[PDB]
Design a protein around this ligand. Structure first.
Ligand SMILES: [Zn+2]
Ligand SMILES: [Zn+2]
Lengths: 411, 613, 656, 40
């Protein structure tokens, strides 16, 4: 059972992919139509292109080619970490829904597969404090807890030792659902890595699992029911081309070029898939039905023309800066230096963008407060004049009474 | 034009608070609009409204569709839904301003918990402490603090797992209790008047004996002031004896004060005398409770100057000044507060551990019911005394019991001699159960049987009354029985005495020369039979052994010579160390309970024999 | 644009200021003169190596800006250095006699052997040639500290200052004290400022009784003295009558003096928490002081081999937090005691953290349920305090003086029986659903329902015996005033769970009750009665039963002597197998063997006794009592409902 | 959006140092922080 989930990018992800398009556009259009300064081939240029665009596809802080110091990484709140990409938002929402379900004693299992290592480290950093009996099947774990999986002499000369049967009545036990963490490198190196554990679903991070792997095949063969496999799936991705060529029922360079053309032609593809419930979906895949809650559209519509080849950013309120397209050759020092200070001037744009949008709300609050003060001052004066009317009524009626008596004596 | 009497939930209270805080050198914002540069002592936290995802966590779909539909209604539809609900009001301008409270609380709590700030004060209206999860109520639209707590508990399951929430608003926090009556990771405590229907809202979930349900049992505490009019020392004693020890017991990760200043001094709705210094001291202790994790939100408050001074003092202690001194320490609170506090400590000791072995409770285990069945090991003691005394008077003089049809009472509650209708001369004794003279083991709460000095003082009159061949009518009243807790010995004494005079004394063929003997504070029931009826044709005199109890005023209802005859025909012995016309001839005794009984048994029985002649 | 409120200064007084600090390198020269090598393996009852450790550890956590540990001015942003001055003679003379000053003026210029004679001569003190000015420096420095407090230059003051000054008398010196420290400073502020300070409360948590300052204000009202110490009337230092809990001031100083005395060494934190939240906060609020002063001594901390208590520094934090809450904010802390350096370092760290303003951390354990001697101690305190103070009245319901001369015993012939009642009700509901036979017993003067017997006991194979007194009575004191309500009391059955567990497995079940005799400290004649009836029932009935095997006995409370005497004066080990007893708190039962001597070993083998955690022992029993076990709770009910499973598992282990 | 890009560049940054503790933004209100991990 293989199901799919609609993922979009975010505003930050789209801006960073526009930055990479601005850094790769001349070389990509050329391929379509310290060190010696000759650096790399065009094949290496598009390898840099699709690898860094898949790095944008998963948590856009991954564009740094510098290891995490493994100190601050376990020292960050969940909200700012999932603020980078929508993938972390839907993944965190998914595991929070699968944790807070209704349970009799249900000790169901879970497993999460990543494609590479640093993604699994970010997974472990996100899932660290969360209430789950975890076990990392990859090296260099992060604060490893020892959840291990299933498969009184008062005097001399005497022996009563009730403490052995006593301590099973005071030792409280965990009842979390079980979860494991591994990469596809381990599954492709060796097998039977997951066949030991009777897992129940593969909510995998990677979308290109090649489902009939040998350990995965014996996993499908041993269990009683079919194991649901759920991948994350970005809407218009370079991987989405190969996944749509797979979605029915050298040469890799051609596939790379056609996938990148499907990506950049559908760069500003404005349609989106939304309204996904999670609880009914996990009820479907754990309780074993055809999950119709997923959106089955799975594919978008697309010779070589011009116009989606100059990079164009998002809309900015009175900032108005350009993208210089990098028309020329490349050195890795110049690559990272141009990327660095281009991100610097981009952050200067967003800095002035936020820094200017202050004072109209300020004047709005000023006028709103003066409006409200005028409002309740009017309400106070209304209460005052209503009290004065309610106090002059009595003298009106008494004056009417003495006019009556004046009329009697008049007659 | 009800502008002279506005409803006291209006937007300007927050403006009064913000005015005072700027007026005492805290805020450097002159214009009284929300800016970011506040100064050096505080930091303005921004605020965004609550999304649907966080607000559906505790509230249902139907309530959200209801509040979403009521945004753009008509005039008359909003008026009809305003009169439909229990003390609420809707508006065209109501929906987006009901999504900002939960957001403000959530942002204050997240800035505290993430360690961007020490403690947080969030002046926010509308209130959010009465609303049930499925329906609004009582000028509450969304239950703010429950939203915030559950949002922390999901969004931070790595540094927060236990949260203690206090409510010092004089109204009971109905919906926030109902949202957590099955949870175990959240503690709720409230202080309010209860009174069963007189004060808002007055339902069964405001009563103290509700403790929780299921696995969330023992995480809910209620302190019910039975009468309004409390002052400082009531709050101080309630904090010292209840709040702080259970707080130090629970080890909270986060403390949520849901403040409502409606019980302050100078109000009209609550009518108390709470000075702001008492608030300062209670916040000082609550600051001391956990490591400092305090969010402070607002619920009540219906008088501007009082809530101004109160929030001033709370801001002063939350920023770092010590709380100021009290107006009067020699305060000595009301005793019914003390006995209900003891009643709380009983069931808290049933659930917690910090009240056993320090309030004389480790003797019995209250987790089983006080039963007469063999399922529970505990057995009440009145059954044994009346059983043994019934067996004794059954073997000696074969005394019948008088059955009480249509009254839910035990069987041998009152006793008579057989052929009591043909007994021409009846003496009706109403006695109380005796007081014992032993030592109480102050830790365990138990007494020692070896030093148990117990005397049945009431029996001896029967030993006089059997010598005169008089008819005997014995009455015992149980002092509240400790089991039902709604019991009152007074009104039930009135029940049985009125029931006896109307049901059986008016049908005896040989009824003549009735005397009356009341012992202890039971005699007030005789007062209820003597101020409300006319028995003086058949009865002759009345005797009371009051002792050190307070005096009984007999006020007649049908005549006025009832009080004069009662002044003439009564012997009421009292305490020598009591020192204090319509009371009916109270007599100060000489030596001293049983000592005045053996001292004046002779004089009472000689007066009865002379009045009977 | 229109202004409505102007800008101005924050109209506060607390915390723009700092914490005043008194420290100097001049208080580390007065030292002992070497006598014997025992001082090398002795705790050195006052060393000068204390105050520099506190100053160093205060520098160690960024609270002090001094990288070189010397008396400097640039203390930092959180603390302010107070300059230190030695006192004049007049201020010491305000509390001390002139001849004491002449004695120290003699001691400043003595010889070596005269100094040795003076060190041996006095009461637990010592001297040196550099003792005069080093005694002149503390209190005047302390006089500086409160001078920064009342005049409001700082928030609060900490004066880490040695030698201590809470044992010296105005007449003579004692206990390594030369002058007073806190009494002289209090006198100096009272004399110097009778305008801003009108009442001073002083607290002592040194584990030794602060006798000297107690004497210095024993007849005054402007000083409220409260100390905490162990008493142990003769043994522990100083062990005088002035440290007793009934010393309540004198004259117009009546109702201004309070001792708290620990009966036994070994208290922890929650004793201190209980003592403060019960007692010192209402009395401190009732006194309405203008300044509180602390004579601190960390000798009662954990890890100290003098006082041997277990006060973690978090407890000190909660202490000083509540004491900061007591006054309006003015506060000064000096130091008296201390033997182990790491404990006083951690303690000083926590008290400095709170005195800057940080909240105290949590307790290392809140579940301790302190020792009952402290509870009875605080009751005996609150009696006399309810005589003098007022806020304790009617909350603990002492109701005035109420010192009760009755509980007279003269009408004891006329009394309710109360035991036949309990046993009769018990027999009633036991026979009502179990139909137990009231087996008779001739030739003894006992009540009828003394032994109750399972119907068809002759065919029953496995018979268990339960022996019990009349079960316990829990009552309720009425909280408003005084007495006990008897009607709101409860019988606590104790055997019935064992009886039901025996009945649902189809065992023979026999019960015996032994009433207690009146006005007896021990139920010795009751023990005689139990021995009589046990020997009787073993002879008359159990020897004659055809189908009988695997007998067990269930001992409860007292009257285990019946089973012990049955084991001793006969032999029945062929048919019975295992005894059990929950003693509780009575005296133990030695077994006398008469028929054999391997019977003693057999009694040690299959037997378990369960006692209190606070029994008279454990302060290792002899084998003639037979495998007692110290449970961890109190009361018979708690240990029954605690180890009921273990005992019933042992009984099931005894059989097949 | 600006907070996300700011916290991106303040984290692990790219190759140079051109533009590039209390207050502990990094979740350090230590109360059952390390202790909520099982530490065994
Ligand atoms: Zn309210
Ligand atoms: Zn000491």
């Amino acid at each position: 059972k293989v199901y799919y989930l609609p993922v979009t990018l975010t505003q930050f992800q789209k801006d960073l992919s526009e930055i990479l398009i601005s850094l790769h556009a001349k070389s990509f259009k050329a391929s379509i139509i310290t060190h010696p300064y000759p650096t790399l081939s065009q094949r290496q240029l598009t390898y840099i292109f699709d690898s860094n665009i898949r790095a944008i596809a998963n948590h856009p802080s991954l564009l740094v080619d510098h290891y995490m110091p493994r100190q601050l990484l376990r020292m960050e709140p969940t909200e700012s970490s999932i603020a980078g990409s929508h993938k972390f938002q839907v993944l965190n929402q998914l595991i929070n829904s699968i944790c807070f379900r209704d349970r009799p004693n249900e000790v169901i299992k879970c497993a999460i597969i990543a494609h590479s290592i640093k993604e699994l480290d970010l997974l472990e950093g996100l899932i660290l404090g969360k209430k789950f009996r975890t076990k990392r099947l990859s090296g260099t774990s992060l604060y490893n807890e020892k959840h291990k999986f299933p498969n009184y002499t008062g005097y001399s000369k005497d022996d009563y030792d009730y403490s052995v049967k006593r301590n099973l009545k005071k030792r409280k036990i965990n009842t979390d659902d079980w979860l494991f963490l591994a990469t596809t490198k381990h599954l492709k190196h060796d097998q039977y890595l997951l066949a030991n554990y009777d897992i129940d679903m593969i909510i995998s991070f990677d979308p290109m699992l090649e489902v009939e792997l040998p350990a995965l095949q014996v996993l499908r063969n041993n269990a009683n029911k079919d194991i649901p496999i759920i991948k994350l799936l970005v809407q218009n991705s370079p991987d989405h081309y190969l996944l749509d060529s797979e979605i029915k029922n050298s040469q890799e360079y051609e596939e790379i070029k056609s996938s990148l053309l499907y990506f950049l032609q559908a760069r500003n593809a404005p349609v989106n898939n939304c309204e996904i419930d999670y609880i009914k979906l996990v009820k479907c895949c754990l309780e074993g039905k055809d999950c119709n809650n997923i959106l089955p559209v799975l594919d978008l519509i697309t010779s070589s023309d011009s116009g989606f080849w100059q990079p164009q950013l998002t809309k900015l309120q009175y900032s108005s800066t350009e993208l210089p397209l990098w028309d020329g050759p490349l050195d890795i020092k110049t690559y990272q230096t141009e990327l660095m200070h281009r991100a610097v001037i981009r952050l200067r744009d967003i800095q002035d963008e936020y820094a200017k949008g202050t004072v109209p709300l300020y004047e709005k609050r000023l006028n709103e407060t003066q409006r409200q003060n005028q409002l309740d001052e009017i309400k106070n004066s209304v209460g005052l004049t209503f009290k004065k009317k309610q106090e002059v009524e009595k003298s009106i009626n008494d004056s009417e009474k003495r006019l009556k008596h004046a009329m009697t004596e008049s007659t | 034009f009800e502008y002279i009497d506005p409803h006291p939930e209006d937007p300007r209270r927050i403006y009064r608070i913000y005015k005072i805080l700027a007026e005492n050198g805290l805020i450097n914002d002159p214009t009284l609009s929300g800016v970011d540069d506040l100064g050096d002592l505080m930091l303005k936290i921004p605020v965004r409204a609550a999304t649907s995802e966080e607000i559906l966590e505790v509230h249902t779909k139907e309530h959200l569709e209801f509040i979403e539909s009521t945004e753009k209604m008509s005039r008359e539809e909003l008026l009809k839904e305003t009169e439909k609900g229990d003390s609420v009001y809707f508006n065209n301008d109501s929906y987006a301003s009901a999504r900002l409270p939960c957001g403000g609380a959530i942002e204050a709590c997240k800035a505290v918990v993430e360690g961007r700030v020490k403690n947080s004060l969030a002046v926010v209206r509308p209130p959010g402490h009465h609303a049930e999860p499925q329906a609004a109520g009582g000028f509450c639209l969304f239950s703010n603090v429950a939203v915030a707590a559950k949002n922390i508990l999901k969004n931070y399951p790595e540094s927060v797992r236990r949260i203690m929430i206090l409510d010092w608003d004089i109204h009971h926090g109905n919906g926030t209790q109902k949202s957590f009556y099955q949870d175990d990771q959240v503690l709720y405590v409230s202080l309010h008047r209860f009174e069963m229907g007189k004060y808002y809202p007055g339902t069964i979930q405001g009563q103290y004996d509700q403790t929780g349900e299921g696995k969330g049992e023992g995480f809910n505490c209620n302190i019910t002031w039975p009468v309004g009019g409390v002052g400082d020392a009531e709050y101080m004693w309630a904090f010292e004896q209840v709040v702080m020890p259970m707080g130090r017991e629970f080890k909270p990760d986060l403390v949520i004060i849901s403040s409502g200043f409606d019980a302050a001094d100078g109000d009209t709705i609550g009518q108390c005398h709470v000075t702001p210094s008492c608030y300062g001291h209670m916040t000082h202790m609550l600051k001391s409770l956990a490591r400092g994790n305090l969010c402070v939100v607002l619920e009540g408050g219906y008088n501007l100057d009082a809530i101004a001074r109160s929030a001033l003092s709370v801001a002063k202690v939350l920023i770092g000044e010590p709380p100021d001194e009290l107006p009067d320490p020699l305060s000595d609170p009301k005793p019914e507060v003390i006995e209900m506090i003891d009643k709380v400590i009983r069931l808290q000791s049933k659930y917690w551990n910090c009240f056993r072995r320090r309030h004389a409770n480790s003797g019995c285990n209250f987790n089983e019911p006080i039963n007469d069945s063999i399922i529970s090991k505990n057995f009440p003691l009145q059954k044994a005394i009346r059983q043994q005394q019934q067996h004794y008077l059954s073997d000696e003089f074969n005394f019948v019991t008088l059955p009480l049809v249509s009254m839910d009472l035990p069987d041998n509650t009152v006793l008579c001699t057989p052929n009591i209708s043909e007994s021409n001369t009846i003496i009706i004794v109403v006695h109380d159960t005796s007081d014992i003279w032993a030592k109480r083991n102050v830790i365990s709460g138990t007494i020692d049987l070896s030093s148990s000095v117990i005397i049945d003082n009431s029996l001896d009159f029967i030993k006089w009354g059997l010598d005169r061949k008089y008819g005997i009518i014995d009455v015992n009243i149980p002092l509240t029985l400790f089991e039902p807790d709604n019991y009152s010995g007074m009104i039930t004494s009135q029940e049985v005495l009125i029931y006896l005079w109307d049901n059986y004394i008016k049908y005896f063929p040989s009824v003549a020369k009735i005397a009356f003997i009341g012992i202890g504070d039971s005699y007030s029931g005789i007062v209820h039979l003597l101020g409300h009826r006319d028995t003086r044709a058949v009865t002759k005199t009345v005797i009371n052994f009051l002792g050190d109890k307070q005096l009984k005023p007999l006020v007649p209802l049908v005549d006025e010579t009832l009080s004069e005859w009662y002044f003439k025909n009564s012997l009421i012995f009292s305490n020598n160390s009591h020192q204090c016309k319509k009371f009916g001839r109270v007599l100060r005794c000489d030596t001293d309970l049983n000592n005045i009984i053996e001292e004046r048994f002779e004089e009472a029985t000689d007066f009865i024999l002379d009045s009977f002649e | 644009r229109q202004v409505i409120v102007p800008v101005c200064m924050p109209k506060i007084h607390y915390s723009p200021l700092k914490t005043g600090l008194c420290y100097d390198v001049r208080m580390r020269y007065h030292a002992k003169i070497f006598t014997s090598y025992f001082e090398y393996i002795d705790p050195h009852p006052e060393d000068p190596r204390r105050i520099y450790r506190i100053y160093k550890i205060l520098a160690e956590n960024g609270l002090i800006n001094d990288p070189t540990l010397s008396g400097v001015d640039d203390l930092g942003d959180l603390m302010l250095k107070i300059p230190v001055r030695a006192a004049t003679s007049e201020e010491i003379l305000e509390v001390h006699t002139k001849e004491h000053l002449e004695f120290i003026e003699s001691t400043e210029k003595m010889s070596r052997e005269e100094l040795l004679k003076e060190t041996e001569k006095g009461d637990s003190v010592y001297f040196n040639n550099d003792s005069y000015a080093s005694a002149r420096l503390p209190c005047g420095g302390a006089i500086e500290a409160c001078k920064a407090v009342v005049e409001g230059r700082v928030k609060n003051s900490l004066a880490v200052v040695r030698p201590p000054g809470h044992h010296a008398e105005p007449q003579a010196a004692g206990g390594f004290c030369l002058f007073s420290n806190v009494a002289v400073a209090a006198k100096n502020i009272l004399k110097n400022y009778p305008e801003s300070v009108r009442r001073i409360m002083i607290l002592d948590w040194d584990i030794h009784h602060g006798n000297g300052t107690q004497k210095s204000f024993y007849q005054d009202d402007q000083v409220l003295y409260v100390s905490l110490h162990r008493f142990e009337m003769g043994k522990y230092y100083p062990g005088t009558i002035q440290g007793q809990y009934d010393q309540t001031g004198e004259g117009k100083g009546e109702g201004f003096n309070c001792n708290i005395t620990w009966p036994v060494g070994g208290v922890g934190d929650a004793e201190y928490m209980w003592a403060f939240e019960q007692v010192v906060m209402p009395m401190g609020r009732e006194f309405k002081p203008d300044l509180v002063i602390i004579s601190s001594g960390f000798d009662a901390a954990d890890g100290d081999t003098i006082g041997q208590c277990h006060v973690t520094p978090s407890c000190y934090g909660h202490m000083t937090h509540m004491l900061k809450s007591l006054a309006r904010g003015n506060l000064c802390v000096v130091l008296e005691g201390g033997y182990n350096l790491d404990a006083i370092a951690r303690s000083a760290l926590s008290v400095a953290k709170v005195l800057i303003g940080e909240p105290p951390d949590e307790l290392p354990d809140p579940l301790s349920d302190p020792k009952p001697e402290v509870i009875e101690m605080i009751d005996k305190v609150i009696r006399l305090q309810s005589k003098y103070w007022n806020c304790f009245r009617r909350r603990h319901a002492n109701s005035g003086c109420n010192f009760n001369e009755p509980l007279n015993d003269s009408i004891i012939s006329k009394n309710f029986p109360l035991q036949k009642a309990i046993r009769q009700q018990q027999q009633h509901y036991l026979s009502d659903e179990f139909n137990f036979v009231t087996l008779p017993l001739v030739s003894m003067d006992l009540p009828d329902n003394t032994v109750l017997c399972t119907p068809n006991i002759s065919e029953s194979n496995t018979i268990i015996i339960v022996v019990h007194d009349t079960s316990d009575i829990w009552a309720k004191r009425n909280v408003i005033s005084g007495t006990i309500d008897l009607s709101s009391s409860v019988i606590i059955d104790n055997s019935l769970d064992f009886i039901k567990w025996g009945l649902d497995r189809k065992y023979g079940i026999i019960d015996v009750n032994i009433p207690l005799t009146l006005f007896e400290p021990d139920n010795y004649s009751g023990m005689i009665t139990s021995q009589e009836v046990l020997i009787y029932l073993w002879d008359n009935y159990i020897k004659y039963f055809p189908s009988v095997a695997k007998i067990a006995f269930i001992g409860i409370g007292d009257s285990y002597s019946g089973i012990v005497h049955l084991l001793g004066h006969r032999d029945t080990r062929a048919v019975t197998k295992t005894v059990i007893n929950f003693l509780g708190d009575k005296q133990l039962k030695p077994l006398v063997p008469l028929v054999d001597e391997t019977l003693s070993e057999w009694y040690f083998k299959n037997s378990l006794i369960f006692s209190n955690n606070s029994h008279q022992c454990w302060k290792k029993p002899r084998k003639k009592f037979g495998r007692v076990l110290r449970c961890d709770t109190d009361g018979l009910n708690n240990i029954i409902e605690e180890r009921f499973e273990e005992a019933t598992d042992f009984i099931l282990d005894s059989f097949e | 959006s600006m907070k996300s890009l700011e916290n991106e560049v303040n984290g692990p940054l790219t190759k140079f140092s051109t533009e590039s503790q209390n207050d502990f933004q990094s979740l350090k209100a230590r109360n059952k922080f390390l202790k909520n991990y099982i530490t065994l």
